[PDB]
Amino acid sequence: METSLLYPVTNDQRTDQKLDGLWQFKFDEAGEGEKSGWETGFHDGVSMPVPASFNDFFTDKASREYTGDFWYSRNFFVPSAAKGKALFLRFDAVTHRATIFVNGKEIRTHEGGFLPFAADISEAVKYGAENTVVVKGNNELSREALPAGDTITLRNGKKMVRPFFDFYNYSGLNRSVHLLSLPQERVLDYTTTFALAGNDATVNYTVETNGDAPVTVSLADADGQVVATAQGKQGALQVQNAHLWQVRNAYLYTLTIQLGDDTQTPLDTYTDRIGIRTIKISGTDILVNDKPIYLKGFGRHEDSPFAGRAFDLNVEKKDFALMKWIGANSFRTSHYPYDEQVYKIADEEGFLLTDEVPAVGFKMASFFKGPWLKKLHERHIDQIRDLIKRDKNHPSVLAWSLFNEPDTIDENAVPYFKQIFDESKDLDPQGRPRTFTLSEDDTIETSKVLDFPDFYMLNRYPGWYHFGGYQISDGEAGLRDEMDKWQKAGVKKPVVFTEFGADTEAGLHKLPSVMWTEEYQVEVLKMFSRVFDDYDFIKGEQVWNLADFQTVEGNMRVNGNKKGIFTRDRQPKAAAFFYHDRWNKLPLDYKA
Amino acid sequence: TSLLYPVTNDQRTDQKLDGLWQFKFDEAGEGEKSGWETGFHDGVSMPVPASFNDFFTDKASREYTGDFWYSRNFFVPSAAKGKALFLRFDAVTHRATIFVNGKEIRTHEGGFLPFAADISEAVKYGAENTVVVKGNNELSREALPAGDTITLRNGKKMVRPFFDFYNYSGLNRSVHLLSLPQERVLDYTTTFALAGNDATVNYTVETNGDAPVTVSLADADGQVVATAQGKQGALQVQNAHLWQVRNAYLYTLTIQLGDDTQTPLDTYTDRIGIRTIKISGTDILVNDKPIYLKGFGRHEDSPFAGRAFDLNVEKKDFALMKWIGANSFRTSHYPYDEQVYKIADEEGFLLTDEVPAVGFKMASFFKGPWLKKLHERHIDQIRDLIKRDKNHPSVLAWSLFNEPDTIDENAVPYFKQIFDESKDLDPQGRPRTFTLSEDDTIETSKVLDFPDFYMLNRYPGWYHFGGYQISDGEAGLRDEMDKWQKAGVKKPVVFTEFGADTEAGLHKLPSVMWTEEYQVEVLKMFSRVFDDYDFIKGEQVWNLADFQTVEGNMRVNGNKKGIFTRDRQPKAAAFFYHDRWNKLPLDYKA
């Protein structure tokens, strides 16, 4: 029930100072952190950068694999000019679980390590003095929290995780920490939808505030020129001769919201950039601004060698440099909400994102049978609400993914899907498509939930998990056989392939190819391309993965996952040049 | 005296002595004073054929320089009493003395051409006998290939070559025990002419007696199509199947000694291809049509045998060269095992046969007292090479130096002499040439009148104008190509080295030197240049596969300029040539 997830801005009514830097850090295996006073703060631990996953900074494995309570400590200054304002610490992500103490006093908890949350500390600090913030984070996985997984205990006592997902359990203060001072009466939320008529457009907005003061809304273009204004919390901004936002061709207008009448100084100002564009599913078409498009891309994680799962602006800007070069125009934020700065860059660069909530693991290799479904569901729907509230105004969000590879064959999955889909059908004012990925075991013959998603996202791995090597010929025929069945039943919704590919160890070559070589990656991708091109209802290809990424140790995991088109260092495998050639030859309206 | 390859029939036997010999180093030079020439069994087992270097875990052995000893027992059949008995050594790198049953039979200089020892009177027919080989692998400016031997401050001897490849040494090729007739074929020659659909093989036969000679040619199905009598003669082949590039057809030649009445005294058989080679101004003509050369760039180098011939690697190297569209290669920088040419003959490849005249330059050379003995051994190894490989249809040209220092005006007497003393050795009179290094250019080279066609070694984008400078390196190469064109070049030009070290697995966007992408970028550049000039009639890239090399800070475990890895898998540049070369016809530029 987060009152507001607006991204921090700086103006005369709102301040935002980052608390990033080095913190004190201590493990707590015994769980006696609070018994012995760590919540008042400490400086007898190890320095830990923020934001950063804490796991890879340690040379010993038990610390890399640590599972339990852990503590971050820091001092921060509160200016005396802040007295009277609404004061918040905004945590952009604490994986997975956090209790926040300021000066020894408990402020709040939070569940879910991938969305932001703020702590009202207005009453917990001395103004004009140094205060202390302590974070008691937790790490464990259970089937009652997203991402789904288990926590086991080695015979020697140490806890460790057995995830139901691929990626590594990178943990800790994974994203920035802000100190905010906001007006007492302020903007909490706003919403935008768009309509196009001829060369003109209309933004339809609403604004939520914690009070009754008047609301002025003003829309300015790229050069600061005001082009529409309106009064009140509902309204319609008329933009004549609009500059539409276009795939791989962004145009962003600045939106400005202010509280007060013209006898006041503005009691609050908020500011955000939005793109004027519309998204419709029509038949099997995905329409952006009423012309069909064809998705090309990935397939991503937030993973980097030094930050773990933490947001790094350098790695993010290179991922976009690469993705623009290679011809992509879309990617899915698998398998969890990304740092907010990523959606701002997709807006700036004209990319189409599939925003995913962290519901991986709904799949035991009897899931929906059990009793952890009650608590799991609360957290799932709550994480879906907060995700849609945070990112709804980004032009680059195209669709919401509400599961990843859930067990759709279990008939008991249908009551759960009915509930999730019912409870979310109206969260997004733009009413974009809501979907999920179907795993390989989940086909037109075996899935029970094919009626729900607004378009289809298939995860197919012929040539890797099935029909590998010289059997690849049988795998293509068996995929063509499935795609034949969709066609017969007459798919009325678009189909998008969202995973496929091949683990590839850069530098491994063979002629002829063998699984794991660079040549085999290309043969596999060429094979998929031949299938995609032979069916009109296939409307996009998102390969797995963009880069190689870290993973839980295992005998099938050559240090992480290696399915990337690029290495973890962000350099290209042979498959990168394949797609660089294919994707820059496919137009935006491919198949139409 | 005879370098014919061994064959098996009723007059001639041939049995390999390959396998595990005994082996000992002789750093002191006491082996003969110690009685080792009588054979020994107190050393280490060593495969033959194979270089001995890579079988030792200590660097002192791997790098050993000096006298080393091989010893083996072998059985001489009773049935062989009365024939000419021979130990034939296919290659002993670089120097050998041969002992049988402790008796010194013969010595040999040069480590890449075969020699035979007559052991007819040194054996006990019907029992075991001993063969011991005393080898040496020192280098000096008086032997090919050229280099120096130094002593370290700790006494140990170490080689410092004037060439790139590693000093792989020992019994690098098979050892045969031969049984030959007392009167036998020693040599033969072939030359060809064409006329319509008919051809003429012009042969001669060298013998060590006066018995009559009888030559017959049969086609691939065994049908006889021409006979002749006499030590000189001409076989008339009606409606001949010509030997074509990447399209071989081989006739079987059979030489037989003795008149129509006696038991046959000797039989010798070989496989030849009917085809002609002419340099017509600026074209290379095979069967009177112009060709365009594409290929490598090779070494005899494999992980486990070293320099030694390994038939598995050779058939694999050939499988790859056909896959990639190539049709030629140069046996840099020394004659190869004789099997390489027979496969070349069966696969219709064109070979440039190179004598180990490498390292004739320092970092001058033709201004030293070593030339006199160097030249002795040089023109002798030229004679042995042409005598051995004459009759192969697949040998296109002879290469008499690799990267000699032709800038000094003193190279000119020596070239003059080498080129006069080889003038009339090859009966087919194929073109004689050599490679010009980066420093030897139209502006600076003093031996440009000698070669029959020009072989160019250029490394823009690697040893000069690397990295972002590559564009200035391309411009300089076209500069030099403009000056050749200005100088009115009348002989053909073939690029025979160019390329870039590449560590398989190193990727960068944009590229940096040593990555797979940069190599493709460099090879594309050279291609752009080659295609804008008509006198350029061939591209032989360096190198086919990563090969081993002396240790140095620029050698990342050997040379890495190879299109394929030392294990013979492709780098990205493999697929660039696979695309390009399989689209250039055999008559590109005509």
Ligand SMILES: [Cl-]
């Ligand atoms: Cl206070």
